[PDB]
Symmetry: C2
Subunit: 409 residues, 2 copies
């Protein structure tokens, strides 16, 4: 997937947007843009409102101004984005006709949603047991284990939806860059992985600090607090709220605190193993290829739909992979999640990835493993034998907040 | 500001209030602010703020709250960066400790008045019987932002009725590479789109 990043950064045409005008600059030193078409397009959250085509006429090292027709100004809420692509109409000796040689995208506007969800005709119904809290609403049921403080299971009808409870995750199956040259015999203590390991990130223990349930007039509200510790040190604290309303939507709010003296964590998110297994993955966010925080310029914000298989990157030596960033809506099966996050989805758990040395040895697990990250560390790469993730991409803030909505159709 | 929602509920350990407001201007929704206030049996009020900023509006100078307190005290005590005025792009010289100054010192008498006096990375602020905790930046004085902005010379400012307090979850940098063009670097503009902050307010 890195190849795309290269392709984009190395493109020969550069763009600037000013008002309704696009300014094109050519980085060719000798040729004129004589086999180039510019396609543009405006979309609102993935929905297309307008498209166009213009042929390029730029001299090597020159500029071309492209005047855009008046753009649509939807009322509907969402993000309006402009995307341009350069196409080579005719084939060449090294390319086919219709080859895309450059692209660029811009956010034009945003209409914030000031809307209120309508009344529910009922509200969920709570039930306290000793072991759990159980909320029910129609066919839908959710259960929270009182000893772990986690959402342990959920049903739609009589069908269980999870094989594993939903929980916080702060680590990743290490990348080659996270490892560098640390060998088991000859450990390299500066390698990220060595530091995470040693701080106990990989083996910290969750401790329930608090798990309460309350009935409000419009919904049921659950509150939890957990601490992850390791040998006396509290590495992280996670405080959440789950609110289930009469519409069957569950809203989750997460606030995490990270000890300033622990190595910055690879990620801040949640995970679970879903029971279900589907064909496609559909999302509204950056894509379509795998993208990470320090490797996402080539990606575009749109609506993508791929087969599950494509959400996995078969690096010969396995590690965390497949992420997609800046996602606002994710759909898989009957589920739907909304917020602002990054995720990955596949049949391999982080643990399996991390424990299998060759791709050919991985085996698909029981359902689908989903990792939803509020934040994720960069990947680096300036070199592979020293820490190469720039500071702007390390999770060093100390306090993080994220939220999501989970629902079914 | 437009009220979108204001609910109250009784939980077992406290009372919970929830609000949502939208700020608009000529049809456009510039910002949305959603909060929760939770008052427990200990008399502490915890506030949680989540703001959304339209990506196409110019980044705002700040994201916070304000109010005019009735009280007027002598000293200001805080645990955060100080002791002098510090802003996000001007705070390396400041130190994180416990400071105590006279109210007067929390004001910077620039001949031509403007926003001033801020202190960043504050974890606890005490003034009078009040106490606030969180992670924020603030300023405190007898002049409202409106007065500062409307008075051209320092000598013309008049102390207002009580104390004006500005608690910011976030604040834009000040710049200065030059004074005749936009000089605030990008890393100091409030461009994230979504902001979250929280505090605890209590009395002694």
């Amino acid at each position: 997937p890195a190849l795309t990043e290269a392709k984009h950064q190395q493109q020969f045409f550069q763009f600037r947007l000013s008002g309704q005008t696009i300014e094109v600059t050519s980085e060719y030193l000798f040729r004129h843009s004589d086999n180039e078409l510019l396609h543009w397009m405006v979309a609102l959250d993935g929905k297309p409102l307008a498209s166009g085509e213009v042929p390029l006429d730029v001299a090597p090292q020159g500029k071309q101004l492209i005047e855009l027709p008046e753009l649509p100004q939807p009322e509907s809420a969402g993000q309006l984005w402009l995307t341009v692509r350069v196409v080579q109409p005719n084939a060449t000796a090294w390319s086919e006709a219709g080859h895309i040689s450059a692209w660029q995208q811009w956010r034009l506007a945003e209409n914030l949603s000031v809307t209120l969800p309508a009344a529910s005709h009922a509200i969920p119904h709570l039930t306290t047991s000793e072991m759990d809290f159980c909320i029910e609403l129609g066919n839908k049921r959710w259960q929270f284990n009182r000893q772990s403080g986690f959402l342990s299971q959920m049903w739609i009808g009589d069908k269980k939806q999870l094989l594993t409870p939903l929980r916080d995750q702060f680590t990743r199956a290490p990348l080659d860059n996270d490892i560098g040259v640390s060998e088991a015999t000859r450990i390299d203590p500066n390698a990220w992985v060595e530091r995470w390991k040693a701080a106990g990130h990989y083996q910290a223990e969750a401790a329930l600090l608090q798990c309460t349930a309350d009935t409000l007039a419009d919904a049921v509200l659950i509150t939890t607090a957990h601490a992850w510790q390791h040998q006396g040190k509290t590495l992280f604290i996670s405080r959440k709220t789950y609110r289930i309303d009469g519409s069957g939507q569950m809203a989750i709010t997460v606030d995490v605190e990270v000890a300033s003296d622990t190595p910055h964590p690879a990620r801040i998110g949640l995970n679970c193993q879903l029971a279900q297994v589907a064909e496609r993955v559909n999302w509204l966010g950056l894509g379509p290829q795998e993208n990470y925080p320090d490797r996402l310029t080539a990606a575009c914000f749109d609506r993508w739909d791929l087969p599950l298989s494509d959400m996995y990157t078969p690096y010969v030596f396995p590690s965390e992979n497949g992420l997609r960033c800046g996602t606002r809506e994710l759909n898989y099966g009957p589920h739907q999640w909304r917020g602002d996050f990054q995720f990955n989805i596949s049949r391999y758990s982080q643990q399996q990835l991390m424990e299998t040395s060759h791709r050919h040895l991985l085996h698909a697990e029981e359902g689908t493993w989903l990792n939803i990250d509020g934040f994720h560390m960069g990947i680096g790469g300036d070199d592979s034998w020293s820490p190469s993730v720039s500071a702007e991409f390390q999770l060093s803030a100390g306090r993080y907040h994220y939220q999501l909505v989970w629902c079914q159709k």
